[PDB]
Amino acid sequence: KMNRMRLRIAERLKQSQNTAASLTTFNEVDMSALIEFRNKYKDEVLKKTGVKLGFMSAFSRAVVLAIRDLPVVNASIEGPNGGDTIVYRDYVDISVAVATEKGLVTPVVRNAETMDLITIEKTIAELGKKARDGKLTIEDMAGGTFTISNGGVFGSLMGTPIINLPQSAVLGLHAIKERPVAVNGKVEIRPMMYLALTYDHRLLDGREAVQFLVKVKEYIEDPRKMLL
Amino acid sequence: KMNRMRLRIAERLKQSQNTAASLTTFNEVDMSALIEFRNKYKDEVLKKTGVKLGFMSAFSRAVVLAIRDLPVVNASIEGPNGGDTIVYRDYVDISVAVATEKGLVTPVVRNAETMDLITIEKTIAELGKKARDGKLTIEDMAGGTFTISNGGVFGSLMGTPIINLPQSAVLGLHAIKERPVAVNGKVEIRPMMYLALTYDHRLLDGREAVQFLVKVKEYIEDPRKMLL
Amino acid sequence: KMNRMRLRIAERLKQSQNTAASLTTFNEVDMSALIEFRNKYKDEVLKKTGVKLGFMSAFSRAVVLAIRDLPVVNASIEGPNGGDTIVYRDYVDISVAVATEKGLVTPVVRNAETMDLITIEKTIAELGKKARDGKLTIEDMAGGTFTISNGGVFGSLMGTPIINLPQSAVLGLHAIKERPVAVNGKVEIRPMMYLALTYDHRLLDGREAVQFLVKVKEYIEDPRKMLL
Amino acid sequence: KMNRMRLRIAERLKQSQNTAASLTTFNEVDMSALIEFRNKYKDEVLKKTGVKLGFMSAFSRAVVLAIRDLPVVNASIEGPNGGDTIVYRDYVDISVAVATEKGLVTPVVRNAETMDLITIEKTIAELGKKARDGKLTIEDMAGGTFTISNGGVFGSLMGTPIINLPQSAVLGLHAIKERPVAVNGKVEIRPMMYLALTYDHRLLDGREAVQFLVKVKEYIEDPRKMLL
């Protein structure tokens, strides 16, 4: 028999689908620079800090810088029957995925727009521990302003991730693969990943939606853009 | 606060989603011939006519010829609670996208199935001017029979465009990219674009939907098919 | 005849020499990454901001990050007859050189440790204008915590720059040259520059002095280290 | 606040600067032979003696043999207001650097001119242990006749080391680097190091100063010269 947890979450799915409008758009991106950079320093970083480096601070920091250009992304749509107000609050709470032994849960880094890459990475590592400990308070998983979800841990080409209502949108991350690529007028083989942006087409307009994803693409593909 | 324009359009989104069934299918296509042809003559054409040539008359004319094989595409589904009638009217009104400074609007070429490629191209150029002038009457944007939408102007791999209810379906156009391709038993590099057909699976049946997109693919990939 | 400005400054030279201890140490560094990065984006940056990009935000930001590891650099030595206190204040005021038509002057960016690379670059451009206008207030040139000086504008291999008393130390920047280099087990030709760190050997100890310069070398040679 | 140790040493710096004249001159040298020789035998040597081999006995022994040609180097300048006497005592006490956890200290090998390379190396290893033990008596660090200082442990191109008053001069050692070199009419890549001789230009005359450094260069570059 389905328990209360199943019933609640299962309802929230098709409920949020019927509440928001919904669209998904896509792109793929070269992972080489990020991978190289990671390999070059993850040990030094670890010895300096106790922090191991994955990729997560990268994606998230890039998202923050893109949001700093496109504040529409962070805002939430509110009032009766969807309501009346785009809530322009511009602190950024980054919800992200963790799979406990009892399945999917969503820790939220509060005020992430203040943070350094290394600090984000550390903060996430803390939450991952505390999550498998079952120590999390519900305020750790009360909704943020934005969400990043990962299917690449299991490994897929492409997902179509769900709106974390009341948030505007969500980014999906997928398997890195070596892929044939056209670059520099040459065939090459490169580490590539696809990206999926799902967004409420209420207030996230197709122009903006594409533009956001594309700007993020740049920051991944050259980490030096983070210096701007 | 959301204004009346936002509220109306935002409702129409999830309303039309809940009204129609909905499916999207895909293909990608070589742009070379069209690009070559454009470059070869756009100047001559311009001097003969005052008309610059993009790609739009091509896609649209191809769509018309495909519709001339597949009249199911042009018809609209009507009556109470979705109703009872596939309206076989076979004049073709081509709705298309323009982004004003106040966002997205949809000029409609009436009776487009009568028109020459150059004339379609001209007609669109007229509407683009009149649109940014704000001179458009609402009858310029009262619904056509079919819709083509462009995300390639912003530049993306792939979108999932919305049904312009009561129309049957919509075609999305995307970024042209150089891509590695297998052709002639050889690896080559070519200008490629992806295509997305979204359709109401009420009355647009999977067979037909695929067949339509595929026929269009041919007309793009060899403009000489337009001579048939 | 020497005027008051000459007499004051001329005294301050040999006075500060007799006041501090004094040592200079050296290294040279590859400019390629920074040069590439600059060329790749200076136009985009300019259109986004009104700011042209030289190199200065790079050197300075690197210096700040090195100071964040080595706070000894920022502190000043104070009290009677040189005194008694290493003043650990850790806001960072970056003095830098401008040659007016009446010769050398030293604008100071206050609180520079807070700033982004682009913002530093902008701030400097503002000061350069205001300097040639003669609009500067003396508080613009009351001493900072650290100093960077440039001879490369005139173009030399190597200088030996003077302690801006009461500051601990100073960095000299020189001509970029193409130079033969050994890299990757191969002879190569690269854009190279020499660096000179002059420091008061009171409280800047040889270990620390070398270590500071070397850490800066890294940040220049890979801008991706700034991401740490 | 600065403690007594800081105050004493800080004074000794600018005091000794104002007491001596002061000049520094430079050269660079191939490390290959010494490196090869070290690698070839350090294990055998260790098993025969309990002594590991760095480079230090080499530099020091070379310095001694050069001093045996140029006794001016070892002598000290003495009497009131700098005085009247070049003290020709020709036993050689080699001061050298150790960085304790409390910073820089200077053990002195007494009567080093008597010693074998292996014995010098051993003697230094003993002192290094006793230094980190804090067991040293002050007579271990009462001034020798000459000084060698190392910045290469931290790793730099070039320093400008301070006169250990009353000694005549000091040698600085730096980072070994692979460097492009011209040799045998050919471009080659080699392990190279720069050398800096600082000397009191009272009684160390420019002729002599250059000649000393150059002779040392030979002994490093061919260890077989030690056989003369």
SS3 sequence, chain D?
CCCHHHHHHHHHHHHHHHHCCCEEEEEEEECHHHHHHHHHHHHHHHHHHCCCCCCHHHHHHHHHHHHHHCHHHCCEEECHHHCCEEECCCCCCEEECEEECCEEECCEECCHHHCCHHHHHHHHHHHHHHHHCCCCCHHHCCCCCEEEEECCCCCCCECCCCCCCCCCEEEEECCCEEEEEEECCEEEEEEEEEEEEEECCCCCCHHHHHHHHHHHHHHHHCHHHHHC
C181 CB neighbours in chain D (<8 A) are 180
Q: How far apart are CA B113 and CA B85, in angstroms?
A: 23
Smallest CA-to-CA distance from C182 within D187, D31, D29 is with D187
DSSP state of A158: -
Q: Which residues of B are catalytic?
A: 201, 205
Cα distances (angstroms) measured from residue D178 to each of C56, C58, D29: 29, 27, 12
Q: Are C136 and C105 in contact (CB under 8 A)?
A: yes
- Both tokens of residue D65? 């043999």
C206 CB neighbours in chain D (<8 A) are 104, 149, 151, 154, 159, 161
A201 CB neighbours in chain B (<8 A) are 13, 162
C224 near A CB under 8 A: yes
A122 CB neighbours in chain C (<8 A) are none
| Mutation for testing the C interface, residue in A57, A115, A224 having most C CBs under 10 Å | A224
B189 near A CB under 8 A: yes
Q: How far apart are CA B112 and CA B91, in angstroms?
A: 8
Return the sign of the alpha-carbon dihedral for residues C147, C148, C150, C156. positive
**If phi over 0 gives left and psi between -120 and 50 gives alpha, with beta otherwise, what is residue B103?**
left
Q: How far apart are CA C150 and CA C58, in angstroms?
A: 14
Q: How far apart are CA B120 and CA B109, in angstroms?
A: 8
**HEC profile of B198-214:** EECCCCCCHHHHHHHHH
Q: Do chains D and B touch (3 or more CB pairs under 8 A)?
A: no
Instruction: Give how far A163 is from chain B: nearest CA, Å.
Output: 14
Instruction: Give how far C18 is from chain D: nearest CA, Å.
Output: 7
Smallest Cβ–Cβ distance between A182 and the set B1, B13, B180 belongs to B180
Contact state of B187 with A187 under an 8 Å Cβ cutoff: yes
A14 near B CB under 8 A: no
- Cis ω before B166 (30° cut-off from 0): yes
Q: Do chains B and A touch (3 or more CB pairs under 8 A)?
A: yes
Q: Which residues contact B141 (CB under 8 A, 6 or more apart)?
A: B105, B106, B107, B108
Smallest CA-to-CA distance from B19 within B204, B209, B181, B163 is with B163
DSSP state of C221: H
Q: Do chains A and D touch (3 or more CB pairs under 8 A)?
A: no
Q: Are C20 and C204 in contact (CB under 8 A)?
A: no
A183 near B CB under 8 A: no
Smallest Cβ–Cβ distance between A21 and the set B1, B13, B157 belongs to B13
Q: Element (H or E) spanning C49, and its range?
A: helix C32-49
Count chain C–chain D contacts defined by CB atoms under 8 A. 84
Q: How far apart are CA D10 and CA D14, in angstroms?
A: 7
What single-letter amino acid sits at D16? Answer: S
Instruction: Give how far A228 is from chain C: nearest CA, Å.
Output: 6
Contact state of D157 with C26 under an 8 Å Cβ cutoff: yes
Smallest Cβ–Cβ distance between C85 and the set D2, D151, D155 belongs to D2
Q: How far apart are CA A171 and CA A211, in angstroms?
A: 14
Smallest Cβ–Cβ distance between D14 and the set C20, C205, C214 belongs to C20
Q: How far apart are CA B164 and CA D70, in angstroms?
A: 98
DSSP state of B84: S
Interface of D with C in 143-162 (CB under 8 A): 149, 151, 154-162
Q: At residue C155, what are phi and psi to the nearest 5 degrees? A: 100, 100
Instruction: Give how far C205 is from chain D: nearest CA, Å.
Output: 8
Chains linked to B by 3 or more Cβ pairs within 8 Å = A
Instruction: Tell me the technique behind this structure.
Output: cryo-EM
Q: State the burial class of residue D174 (Cβ atoms within 10 Å of its Cβ: 0-12, 13-18, 19+).
A: buried
Contact state of A224 with C37 under an 8 Å Cβ cutoff: yes
Contact state of B157 with A86 under an 8 Å Cβ cutoff: no
What single-letter amino acid sits at D27? Answer: N
A41 near C CB under 8 A: yes
What single-letter amino acid sits at A199? Answer: Y
Chains linked to A by 3 or more Cβ pairs within 8 Å = B, C
Instruction: Give how far C198 is from chain D: nearest CA, Å.
Output: 10
Interface of C with A in 57-116 (CB under 8 A): none
Contact state of B189 with A182 under an 8 Å Cβ cutoff: yes
Q: How far apart are CA D170 and CA D164, in angstroms?
A: 7
What residues does D26 pair with on adjacent strands?
A: D196
Return the sign of the alpha-carbon dihedral for residues C77, C80, C81, C83. negative
Contact state of C85 with D157 under an 8 Å Cβ cutoff: no
Taking the CA atoms of residue B39, residue B40, residue B45 and residue B50 in that order, the dihedral angle to the nearest 10 degrees is 30
Q: How far apart are CA A63 and CA A212, in angstroms?
A: 9
Smallest CA-to-CA distance from D146 within D91, D98, D224, D196 is with D91
